[PDB]
């Protein structure tokens, strides 16, 4: 049973890889990716590095503005790494739970990022749950590991450590960075952090870049992501619409692309489904400039919606 959180990887369905040529240069539009060339090219170097077994102790940081494909690149890194590599996208804040401890939240996402080839492509977690289903314990983990280990020593199975993507890294506390430090220091996956912030106070007065302490940042490589051109904005929206199965006019694409540059690429893409449903109620096939203009007026981006309340106070 595949316990992959389907929803978390729903905005990146079109991403098939980095789309770089035999040497290592990015094409305008390849493997579902558009623009963001320098970042895509730098990702390929890390793809060759893991395959060269030279990422030992080394981690990755994809830092830039939100909606500049930081999650998309991290997914493509797993895609390029091998055939169906275990990609787990977590958020720094996910460890803060009243119900379960940080340790078990981190372990769960780590097991979700280490796979197994038996051709049966199943992760360590997709087997952890198979054993319990009342709750995943540490003795229960030893039971799966005893099974997992013999498979290699019998030659039946080969282990595949993947990609653990972490957005909002500055949110993790001092204890959480120490946990990751041991994890990275091992058949462990690749920790890829993503930050939209600069100098930040480490959670738990000690300020440092991206909220990551200097002890971990010494072993961290940074790959910058950049804002998109209005031509790239039109492309990414068109891909998402082609992946979603929604018809849209180029007259509306200019507007929806302009909306994106003004707000964010994530919000403009998320406007496709409501714009589609507005049109279905009118009995149309495609989305026109007026359909976008209406939805963009009906709905607001969190940035301009909190601006109205401040304007009113």
């Amino acid at each position: 049973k595949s316990t992959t959180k389907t929803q978390r990887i729903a905005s990146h369905s079109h991403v098939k890889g980095l789309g770089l040529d035999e040497s290592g240069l990015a094409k305008q539009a390849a493997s579902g990716l558009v623009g963001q060339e320098n970042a895509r090219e730098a990702c390929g170097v890390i793809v060759e590095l893991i395959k060269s077994k030279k990422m030992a102790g080394r981690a990755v940081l994809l830092a830039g503005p939100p909606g500049t494909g930081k999650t998309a690149l991290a997914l493509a890194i797993a895609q390029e790494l091998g055939s169906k590599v275990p990609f787990c996208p977590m958020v720094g804040s996910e460890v803060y739970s009243t119900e379960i401890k940080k340790t078990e939240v981190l372990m769960e996402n780590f097991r979700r990022a280490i796979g197994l080839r038996i051709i049966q492509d199943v992760t360590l977690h997709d087997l952890d749950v198979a054993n319990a289903r009342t709750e995943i314990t540490d003795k229960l983990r030893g039971e799966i590991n005893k099974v997992v280990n013999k498979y290699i020593d019998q030659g039946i199975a080969e282990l595949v450590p993947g990609v653990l993507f972490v957005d909002e890294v500055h949110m993790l506390d001092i204890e959480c960075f120490t946990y990751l430090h041991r994890a990275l220091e091992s058949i462990a996956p690749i920790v890829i952090f993503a930050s939209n912030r600069g100098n930040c106070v480490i959670r738990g007065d000690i300020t440092s870049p991206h909220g990551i302490p200097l002890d971990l940042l010494d072993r961290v490589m940074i790959i910058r992501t950049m804002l998109y051109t209005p031509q790239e904005m039109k492309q990414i929206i068109k891909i998402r619409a082609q992946t979603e199965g929604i018809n849209i006019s180029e007259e509306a694409l200019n507007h929806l692309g302009e909306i994106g540059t003004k707000t964010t690429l994530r919000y403009s893409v998320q406007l496709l489904t409501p714009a589609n449903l507005l049109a279905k109620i009118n009995g149309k096939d495609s989305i026109e400039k007026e359909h976008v203009e209406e939805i963009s007026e009906l709905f607001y981006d969190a940035k301009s919606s909190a601006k109205i309340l401040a304007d009113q106070q």
């Binding site: 959180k5 929803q7 729903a10 939100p66 958020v91 804040s93 996910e94 803060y96 739970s97 009243t98 119900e99 009342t134 957005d167 909002e168 500055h170 949110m171 939209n196 106070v201 959670r203 964010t264 994530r266 919000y267 998320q270 489904t273 409501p274 449903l277 507005l278 109620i281 939805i295 009906l298 709905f299 607001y300 981006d301 969190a302 940035k303 919606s305 909190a306 601006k307 109205i308 309340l309 401040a310 009113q312 106070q313």
Partner: protein
């Protein structure tokens, strides 16, 4: 009921607002709510969420009520404030658990998942484990059907990160209610965090929200809302007083103008009067205070 007058959003199949079903004005938010309703009915609402950003008493609670009501009958509902989850009897997660289990219903009448938990409680974790596996057991036979509704969390700015992380986890379920949130605050710090964010909600969650905005009501829009509540309270009032009360609603608060209706009928009644008059209003306004006048009087004392 404070929203007893609401039966729906008052929209036609062309999704244009009538300006109907208990709704008056707030044309912008009423239309956007119908679009949101279409996404739920089309099953294109997973991963996503709703956020009604507006000044207190501008429709937000009623728009979410009208949304649950227009989605058909027997649809479960739960209206909890952000501060309600912080209890001496409960736990932050357990309080939200019960709010999620209240907005998820089971049809043979429609019995909510929390109601089932009430039968086996003085709710213990062992109790929920047995019920959850028994509902999927009733799903195999097809005897029972899971019909989740709306969970309206007003004062969302009160929620901390431990609770926002819980929301993410709770919304990940195949059977999940549509989360409707409301706030009056703009850029606020997330409770439990040092960082600032629009509406006091984390950056990750705002990238899933269908943000809708409620604007203030004009004199004509307030007069109809006050007329509806007067008729709802069985309080016949003079048209001269409907003017004065709506002026108080604009200058002070709608929540306060409605608060004065109940007490104005009694002032009128005690003086053996027919319908509520301006002098019953002028008096009830001088008797009961509004937070603005209430605080300024305290500010005027401390300075002396």
């Amino acid at each position: 009921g404070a929203h007893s007058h609401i039966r729906g959003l008052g929209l036609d199949d062309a999704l244009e607002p009538r300006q109907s079903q208990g709704m008056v004005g707030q044309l912008a938010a009423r239309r956007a709510a119908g679009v949101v309703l279409e996404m739920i009915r089309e099953g294109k609402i997973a991963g996503r969420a709703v956020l009604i950003a507006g000044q207190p008493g501008t429709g937000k609670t009623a728009i979410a009520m009208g949304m649950a009501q227009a989605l058909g009958p027997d649809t479960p509902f739960t209206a909890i404030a952000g501060s309600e989850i912080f209890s001496l009897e409960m736990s932050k997660t357990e309080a939200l658990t019960q709010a999620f289990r209240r907005s998820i219903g089971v049809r043979i009448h429609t019995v909510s998942l929390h109601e089932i938990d009430v039968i086996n409680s003085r709710i213990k974790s062992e109790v929920r484990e047995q019920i959850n596996a028994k509902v999927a057991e009733w799903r195999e036979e097809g005897k029972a059907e899971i019909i989740p509704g709306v969970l309206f969390i007003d004062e969302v700015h009160m929620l901390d990160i431990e609770s926002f992380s819980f929301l993410n986890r709770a919304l990940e379920s195949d059977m999940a209610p549509v989360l409707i949130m409301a706030t009056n605050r703009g850029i606020t710090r997330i409770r439990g965090t040092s960082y600032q964010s629009p509406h006091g909600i984390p950056i990750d969650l705002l990238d899933r929200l269908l943000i809708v905005s409620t604007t203030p009501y004009s004199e004509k829009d307030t007069k109809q809302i006050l007329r509806i509540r007067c008729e709802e309270e069985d309080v016949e009032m003079s048209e001269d007083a409907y003017t004065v009360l709506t002026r108080i609603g604009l200058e002070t608060s709608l929540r306060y103008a409605i608060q004065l209706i109940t007490a104005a009928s009694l002032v009128c009644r005690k003086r053996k009067g027919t319908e509520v008059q301006v002098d019953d209003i002028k008096r009830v306004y001088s008797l009961f205070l509004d937070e603005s006048r209430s605080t300024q009087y305290m500010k005027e004392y401390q300075d002396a």
